[PDB]
Design a protein around this motif. Sequence first.
Motif, short mmCIF file in Angstrom:
data_model
loop_
_atom_site.label_atom_id
_atom_site.label_comp_id
_atom_site.label_asym_id
_atom_site.label_seq_id
_atom_site.Cartn_x
_atom_site.Cartn_y
_atom_site.Cartn_z
N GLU A 59 0.83 -1.20 0.00
CA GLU A 59 0.00 0.00 0.00
C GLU A 59 0.87 1.25 0.00
OE1 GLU A 59 -2.16 -1.50 3.28
OE2 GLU A 59 -3.93 -2.12 2.15
N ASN A 60 0.83 1.98 -1.13
CA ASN A 60 1.70 3.10 -1.49
C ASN A 60 3.15 2.90 -1.03
OD1 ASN A 60 1.64 4.16 1.35
ND2 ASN A 60 -0.43 4.84 0.80
N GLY A 61 3.66 1.68 -1.15
CA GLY A 61 5.07 1.40 -0.96
C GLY A 61 5.48 0.84 0.38
N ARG A 62 4.62 0.08 1.06
CA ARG A 62 4.97 -0.46 2.36
C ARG A 62 5.91 -1.66 2.24
NH1 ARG A 62 1.54 -3.52 6.06
NH2 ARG A 62 0.30 -1.65 6.59
N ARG A 63 5.62 -2.60 1.34
CA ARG A 63 6.34 -3.87 1.37
C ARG A 63 7.77 -3.72 0.85
NH1 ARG A 63 5.94 -10.20 -0.05
NH2 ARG A 63 6.89 -10.56 2.00
N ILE A 64 7.96 -3.04 -0.28
CA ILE A 64 9.33 -2.83 -0.76
C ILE A 64 10.11 -1.98 0.23
CG2 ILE A 64 10.82 -1.91 -2.56
CD1 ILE A 64 9.66 -3.47 -4.38
N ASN A 65 9.43 -1.06 0.92
CA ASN A 65 10.07 -0.34 2.02
C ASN A 65 10.58 -1.29 3.11
OD1 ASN A 65 9.63 2.76 1.55
ND2 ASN A 65 10.15 2.55 3.73
N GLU A 66 9.87 -2.40 3.34
CA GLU A 66 10.36 -3.40 4.29
C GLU A 66 11.49 -4.22 3.68
OE1 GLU A 66 5.82 -4.41 5.46
OE2 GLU A 66 7.32 -5.16 6.90
N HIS F 12 11.04 -3.65 21.74
CA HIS F 12 9.68 -3.23 21.42
C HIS F 12 9.63 -1.82 20.85
CE1 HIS F 12 7.10 -6.37 23.74
NE2 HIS F 12 8.11 -6.93 23.09
N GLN F 13 10.46 -0.91 21.38
CA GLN F 13 10.55 0.43 20.81
C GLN F 13 11.13 0.40 19.40
OE1 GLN F 13 12.25 3.60 23.21
NE2 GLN F 13 13.66 4.24 21.57
N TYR F 14 12.35 -0.14 19.25
CA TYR F 14 13.03 -0.13 17.97
C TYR F 14 12.23 -0.84 16.89
CZ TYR F 14 16.24 -2.17 14.50
OH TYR F 14 16.82 -2.65 13.35
N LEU F 15 11.50 -1.90 17.25
CA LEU F 15 10.66 -2.56 16.26
C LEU F 15 9.55 -1.65 15.76
CD1 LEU F 15 9.72 -4.96 14.59
CD2 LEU F 15 8.56 -5.88 16.58
N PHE F 16 9.12 -0.69 16.58
CA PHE F 16 8.00 0.15 16.16
C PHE F 16 8.45 1.25 15.20
CE2 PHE F 16 5.17 3.80 16.70
CZ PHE F 16 3.96 3.21 16.38
N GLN F 17 9.57 1.90 15.47
CA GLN F 17 9.99 2.99 14.60
C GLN F 17 10.51 2.46 13.28
OE1 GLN F 17 13.01 5.34 16.63
NE2 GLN F 17 14.63 3.83 16.27
N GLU F 18 11.38 1.45 13.33
CA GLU F 18 12.02 0.91 12.14
C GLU F 18 11.18 -0.14 11.44
OE1 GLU F 18 15.85 1.12 11.72
OE2 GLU F 18 16.35 2.29 13.51
N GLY F 19 10.18 -0.70 12.12
CA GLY F 19 9.26 -1.63 11.50
C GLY F 19 9.84 -2.97 11.13
N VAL F 20 11.16 -3.11 11.13
CA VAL F 20 11.76 -4.35 10.69
C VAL F 20 13.02 -4.58 11.50
CG1 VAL F 20 13.49 -4.03 8.84
CG2 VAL F 20 11.52 -5.59 8.52
#
Lengths: 78, 107, 53, 26, 71, 96
Positions: A59-66, F12-20
């Motif tokens: 969704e507007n670039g979420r997955r490639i961003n991951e 838990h913090q770092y996972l939220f901002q960086e998402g991965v």
Amino acid sequence: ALISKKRKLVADGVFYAELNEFFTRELAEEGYSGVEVRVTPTKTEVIIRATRTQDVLGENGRRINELTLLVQKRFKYA
Amino acid sequence: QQQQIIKIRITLTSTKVKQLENVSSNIVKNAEQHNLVKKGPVRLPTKVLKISTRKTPNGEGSKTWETYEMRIHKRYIDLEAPVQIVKRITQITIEPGVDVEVVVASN
Amino acid sequence: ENVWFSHPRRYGKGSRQCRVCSSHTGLIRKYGLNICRQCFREKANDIGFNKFR
Amino acid sequence: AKKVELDAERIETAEKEAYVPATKVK
Amino acid sequence: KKVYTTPKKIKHKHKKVKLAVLSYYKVDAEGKVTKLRRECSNPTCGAGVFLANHKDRLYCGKCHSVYKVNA
Amino acid sequence: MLMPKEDRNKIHQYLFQEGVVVAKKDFNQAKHEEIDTKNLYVIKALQSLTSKGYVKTQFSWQYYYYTLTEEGVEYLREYLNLPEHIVPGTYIQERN
RNA sequence: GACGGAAGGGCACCACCAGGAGUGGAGCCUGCGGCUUAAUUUGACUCAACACGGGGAAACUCACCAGGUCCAGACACAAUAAGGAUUGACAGAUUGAGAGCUCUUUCUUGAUUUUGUGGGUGGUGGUGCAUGGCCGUUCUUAGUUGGUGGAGUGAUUUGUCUGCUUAAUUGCGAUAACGAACGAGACCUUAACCUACUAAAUAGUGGUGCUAGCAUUUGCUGGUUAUCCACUUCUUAGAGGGACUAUCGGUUUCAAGCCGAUGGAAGUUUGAGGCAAUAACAGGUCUGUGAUGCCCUUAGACGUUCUGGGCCGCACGCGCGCUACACUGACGGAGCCAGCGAGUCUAACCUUGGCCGAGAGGUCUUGGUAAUCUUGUGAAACUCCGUCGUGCUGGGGAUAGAGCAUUGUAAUUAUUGCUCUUCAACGAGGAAUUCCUAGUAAGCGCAAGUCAUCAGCUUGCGUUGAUUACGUCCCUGCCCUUUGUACACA
Ligand SMILES: [Mg+2]
Ligand SMILES: [Mg+2]
Ligand SMILES: [Mg+2]
Ligand SMILES: [Mg+2]
Ligand SMILES: [Mg+2]
Ligand SMILES: [Mg+2]
Ligand SMILES: [Mg+2]
Ligand SMILES: [Mg+2]
Ligand SMILES: [Mg+2]
Ligand SMILES: [Mg+2]
Ligand SMILES: [Mg+2]
Ligand SMILES: [Mg+2]
Ligand SMILES: [Mg+2]
Ligand SMILES: [Mg+2]
Ligand SMILES: [Mg+2]
Ligand SMILES: [Mg+2]
Ligand SMILES: [Mg+2]
Ligand SMILES: [Mg+2]
Ligand SMILES: [Mg+2]
Ligand SMILES: [Mg+2]
Ligand SMILES: [Mg+2]
Ligand SMILES: [Mg+2]
Ligand SMILES: [Mg+2]
Ligand SMILES: [Mg+2]
Ligand SMILES: [Mg+2]
Ligand SMILES: [Mg+2]
Ligand SMILES: [Mg+2]
Ligand SMILES: [Mg+2]
Ligand SMILES: [Mg+2]
Ligand SMILES: [Zn+2]
Ligand SMILES: [Zn+2]
């Protein structure tokens, strides 16, 4: 930096292999089909070859961003 | 108001002799197309990376061995140029799988 | 905090594994490519080691 | 969209009055 | 295989004795609080941690180990 | 697993901002790259996070890759108590 | 179809002929059995197990054994519980241990854990006779199939064949077949040929400076990582070219082909490989894999880590090897020539040179991420002049004592290296048995793999360089028809 050429070219080859694995596992329900990596000034490029790219984007670039962040955080790209 | 000489050295290394040579020769006709002075592409002896291994994961069977190779072709082309071309020529003529290296300084 | 859980892995087969499968047995170490021979063969093509002769 | 940028929300909600400190007798 | 060799007397874990925690805060006369169990002088122990009283021993439990204070 | 909530927050913090999150499969590392905790605390924390949904896991060559999910987003939103529509790895950065 | 302990044809140095060099005998190396043992982890047993699992194991590896720790037992519920669910530890005792393992004593920690059930999780636990994948064997083989037609009610057959030829179902020819495809060939890689093409201070030549030595008569022999000029024969690698068994001649259904001669870098598929159809195996591998079904186990663990031992254990049987028995030689001086390789960044690889040391080594520096430096890898056999003189001799170097060094946290059951000493068997090897046809065999070292240290192994490499065939089916092995079958899980 500061490698040997023999060590360099082999190191890149391994780099391809580990990369192609991680996508092969992570993009299976998307018909992933292979990659190429373009090494340029200021950028390294990676072109995902899948048949269902609208799910690779997200969704507007979420997955490639991951996926970038993934490829990023592992191989230590800035 | 710019553009003095620098005495550059562009080394080309790759395992794809068709794309390597294309980038290698197109450079030589993108420099005498515009009248620099140079020493033509110098081919270094292609080195061959051998890997000799048994095919069997296990030990059974006659001892079948198998050797893979990976050939490395490394060129260099020496150019006397200003800053305007070398930077135009580094961005362009990129090729996925041909590692360009540009060094300077006869010292 | 546990000074009772490790012992020198600085050299020999205990220090290294296969970067794919983590086996120490029959590692191809040439060219710093550090892959066991069974994994090398299933990756040799993608690494750029091909079969000419 | 879906703003406030958590990476900097701790930097905007970085205003004080969320602690306490006093010790050191004998 | 060769299951179950085992000459006897199995070993036990720790128990962490109950020890319904300190009333070791003796007040004197309503409500002068005299604060038994002298505290600890290491800046990682903000004087809220006390010192264990064994023989030849005042031990800071908060320092998992560190700093034997001798009195 | 056993660990002080102090280290739980850094994950838990770092996972939220960086998402991965990424992590090499080697316990005993004693310090994650990019995080302030033992490697072991990371892997088993995400494993705990993964087994109640909230995140997927990929392995591929001795490195876990953890993908924070949509249902996870609200959980650590609670655990970090940040308000609804705070953030994620879900920002298109400026113009890239 | 498959199979036969029937018949007829082939093919091959994993077959013989003609021989070579050996193995089989000996000392040791190394694997397998056996025995031994706390354990001596384990797979594999004709070719197709036995220097094979890249398997050269001091810790690690590691699976085995004697012991000590840890949970890294996700998540759901339930119980426990803020009057504390739980965590940790100083010294002592204890312990191989400076493991708070346990225990004494008594602080500490704050809902992360605990207990329980359910569920899972790891496992070099079992199952290769449940599987994937890969590999090996048949296979140093030549087989597989459809279109149009012909034969049969049909499954099918013919094509795909007596003969000839070929390394080849390779073709010629014969022909109810004609004309094609997979596989063989083609193709690809490497080693050979270019004074023709494009050049190269990271390759090298001739000229010239600048410069040394000897002769002097102008010469000869060197020095000088840029003092310049030019060239590309030599080296490098791009693009091309070159061979198609050519020309001629013998032989032959004068067919495919074959043989000799000339020419040619090259005429044995040019040499050597890479690739390789359909099919079969209860071939090997769950011990390469975070490939996997099921079974087992899962906290006094078959998880894992740590300490130590073991895989090396020694009446013996078998296999791969190494070094030998000397005079085509040992030894000592001297000559002195390769090729395939590798080599250190967030680091201690490849090492020149100078010193010190008999030696191994040490120490000070240095070049190199490499056609640039190590390196001309001045390797070894070899060639030259001497010593020894046939005597277990100075051949031989097992065993063993004593000292010095390196690798590593560690060297004892002695990792390796060096020095002195000790000086065994072995006087050419029974029955047997292996490998091979030209730059091949054999002799000879070297680089790489493994590798902290250790090659008597392996993958490749160059150096010195023969004898004897250029045949056949006798031995063995396998293909092919014919033929028999009550087999078809064959
Ligand atoms: Mg060459
Ligand atoms: Mg014979
Ligand atoms: Mg004989
Ligand atoms: Mg078995
Ligand atoms: Mg051990
Ligand atoms: Mg522990
Ligand atoms: Mg449970
Ligand atoms: Mg249960
Ligand atoms: Mg397993
Ligand atoms: Mg089988
Ligand atoms: Mg199988
Ligand atoms: Mg033959
Ligand atoms: Mg009909
Ligand atoms: Mg037939
Ligand atoms: Mg030339
Ligand atoms: Mg001739
Ligand atoms: Mg079987
Ligand atoms: Mg397997
Ligand atoms: Mg063994
Ligand atoms: Mg001698
Ligand atoms: Mg000599
Ligand atoms: Mg001395
Ligand atoms: Mg340097
Ligand atoms: Mg003698
Ligand atoms: Mg003889
Ligand atoms: Mg070696
Ligand atoms: Mg070996
Ligand atoms: Mg013959
Ligand atoms: Mg019949
Ligand atoms: Zn592997
Ligand atoms: Zn204290």
